From a paper:
The best-known example of such a heteroclitic peptide is derived from the Melan-A/MART-1 where the natural 10-mer epitope is EAAGIGILTV, as used in this study. This natural sequence does not have an optimal anchor residue at p2 for the HLA A2 restriction element. In summary, we used a T-cell clone derived from the TIL of a melanoma patient that persisted in patient PBMC after long-lasting tumour remission to generate a novel APL super-agonist peptide with the sequence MTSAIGILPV. This APL was capable of inducing greater numbers of T-cells specific for the natural antigen EAAGIGILTV from the PBMC of 14/14 healthy donors and 2/2 patients tested compared to the natural antigen itself.
One possible explanation for why the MTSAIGILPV peptide induced more EAAGIGILTV-specific T-cells than the EAAGIGILTV peptide itself might be because it exhibits enhanced binding to the HLA A2 restriction element and would therefore be present on the cell surface at higher copy number when supplied exogenously. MTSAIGILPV exhibited substantially improved binding compared to EAAGIGILTV, binding almost as well as the ELAGIGILTV sequence. To further explore the nature of HLA A2-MTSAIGILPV interaction and peptide presentation mode, we solved the structure of the binary pHLA complex at 2.45 Å. The optimal position 2 anchors for HLA A2 are L, M and I so it was not clear why the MTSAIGILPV exhibited such strong HLA binding. However, the structural analysis demonstrated that, although the total number of contacts between the peptide and HLA-binding groove were only marginally greater for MTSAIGILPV compared to EAAGIGILTV (136 and 134 respectively), the longer side chain of threonine at position 2 in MTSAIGILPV protruded deeper into the HLA B-pocket than alanine at position 2 in EAAGIGILTV. This enhanced tethering at the N-terminal anchor position likely plays a chief role in enabling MTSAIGILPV to form a more stable interaction with HLA A2, contributing to the greater observed immunogenicity of this peptide compared to EAAGIGILTV. Despite differing in amino acid sequence at 5/10 positions, the structural analysis also demonstrated that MTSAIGILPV is a surprisingly close structural mimic of EAAGIGILTV (root mean square deviation = 0.38), sharing a virtually identical peptide backbone conformation. The peptides were also remarkably similar in terms of buried and exposed peptide side chains, with peptide residues 4, 5, and 6 forming the outward facing central bulge in the peptide, and residues 1 and 8 also pointing away from the HLA surface as additional potential TCR contact sites. Thus, the structural analysis provides a molecular basis for why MTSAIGILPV is more stably presented than EAAGIGILTV, and why T-cells primed with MTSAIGILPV can recognise the tumour associated EAAGIGILTV peptide.
Numbering used by the authors:
A (entry chain B): 0 to 99
B (entry chain A): 1 to 276
C (entry chain C): 1 to 10
Write the structure that this text describes.
Amino acid sequence: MIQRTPKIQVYSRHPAENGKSNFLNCYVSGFHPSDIEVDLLKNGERIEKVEHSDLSFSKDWSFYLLYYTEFTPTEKDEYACRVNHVTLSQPKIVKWDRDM
Amino acid sequence: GSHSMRYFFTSVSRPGRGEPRFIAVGYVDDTQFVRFDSDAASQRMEPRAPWIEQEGPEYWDGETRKVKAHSQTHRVDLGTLRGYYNQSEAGSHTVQRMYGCDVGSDWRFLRGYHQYAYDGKDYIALKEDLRSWTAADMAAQTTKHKWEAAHVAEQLRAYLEGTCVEWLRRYLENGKETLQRTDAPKTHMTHHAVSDHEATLRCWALSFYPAEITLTWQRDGEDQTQDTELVETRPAGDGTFQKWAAVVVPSGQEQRYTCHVQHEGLPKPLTLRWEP
Amino acid sequence: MTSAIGILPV
């Protein structure tokens, strides 16, 4: 069967302002099969209180999911998204970039 | 103008770990309104939008009943497909099903679909005429014959041209505030150094609905689609969407370049230009 | 709403 690897984007709901209220999104799309591990990280540790959309798929039959968590960004605190899939020999970490 | 309803169903087998996972979701245009998820506590079809929560208690019972049926059907399908492809018991496998319908500005039936996949690849689907199947291979030609004998095409054509459309038109009037109004992009443009003699210009579209949008870059009013970078359109998590388009350029040339947005909500197209 | 008809096993 066809294995297709995830495309990943980490970004916030609104434009970030330090010390102001926001959501942090990790969008994993374009992948197959469906069994995927997704974790948001703060200074490299699991944020427990994370939620996710209901699994769905695209015209090409590949899966997509939004994971999100309330946060308050700041200057020094470093947010990431870690992804494991059957197509990745090791988990893939993607840092949050305010300007992407 | 046009609108649509879509239901999406996924089952995954868990070969030494019991019952198949099953998830269904339905959307009107880009707004999700319901879900069912075998592995959650309630085992009911649940509301996922405010405008659908008003619906009577017999809405949920029937939708629940029906979806557990689709489920027991996908469950049988997993066993038959393993049989047809002679795959071992050991492996995890996947069926997906998609159906629904589109309408015009006049809200009249326009087209319908019904598509089925095994292990992420076309297995059988219903053609545009609504009367015939496109079968991907020999295993699936066996299914095509079973469905030609049970008149499945006619049975789905009657759901598609009838029940699907009527109930779409319904939801539109009940969730009109959220489903008929169309948020135009808040657009903005950024600039970053990437070295001594180069610079990135990123064109941003934020906070828009529906998802259909187009971002392009021009050098002196001439398209150039290579040396660009365009991300997949992504949901903001609050109904709206986001997208950006970038292009790497020579330092000092930033006003050669222009960003062009096209969206349903904008009347003229927009043009952007690095100034700040 | 989902369909009561034409959802048959393969």
